[PDB]
A paper describes a structure:
A major step forward was the discovery in 1999 that the primary repressor of NRF2 is KEAP1, with 27 cysteines in humans, 25 of which are highly conserved. To determine the pKa of KEAP1 C151, we used a construct containing only three cysteines (versus 27 in full-length KEAP1) consisting of just the BTB (Broad-Complex, Tramtrack and Bric-a-brac) domain (residues 48–180, with a S172A mutation), which has been widely employed for crystallographic studies of C151-targeted electrophiles.
To assess the protonation state of C151 at various pHs, the thiolate-reactive probe monobromobimane (mBBr) was used, as it produces a fluorescent monobimane-thiol conjugate. In contrast, for the C151S BTB protein, the protein was unmodified by monobimane, confirming that only C151 is modified in WT BTB. However, the density was ambiguous and not continuous, suggesting that the ligand was flexibly bound and adopting multiple conformations. C151-conjugated monobimane was also docked using this method. The scores overall were lower than for the pre-covalent docking, and again, no one pose had a distinctly larger and more negative docking score than the others, supporting our hypothesis that the lack of clear electron density for monobimane in the crystal structure is the result of the ligand adopting multiple conformations. Overall, the data suggest that monobromobimane, with its relatively flat geometry, largely hydrophobic nature, and possibly its ability to make hydrogen bonds, fits well into the relatively flat, hydrophobic C151 pocket in multiple orientations that place its electrophilic carbon near the C151 thiolate, significantly accelerating the reaction relative to the simple thiolate in NAC.
Author numbering: 50 to 180
Amino acid sequence: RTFSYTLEDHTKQAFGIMNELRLSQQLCDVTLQVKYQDAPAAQFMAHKVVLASSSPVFKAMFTNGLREQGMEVVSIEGIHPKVMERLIEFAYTASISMGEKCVLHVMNGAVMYQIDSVVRACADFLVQQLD
């Protein structure tokens, strides 16, 4: 009496569309303004719900108890713009790539937004690079 179906690639396909929408700057409700020390300021438009799905830190920031009147600007310090870019790409794609010289800075940024997956991968890379 009961019929049930699952599309395994669905989440992969849907995240692909969400990343397309980020890059077109469509349906975005947060702008991250990133200023790190000497480097020129940068900004990143995104979807609060997607960032929240990949970072307990963004989730708490955005789930405030009074719903938001539109597009929010968020000031970020202490993370290089190039690192934030890579973390956002991870959330939207599940992949991240960097040069060996940047692995430490990305791990630092991933600790700051509690992206446990990226923390683990970077830690494991650094340790293999020993001895």
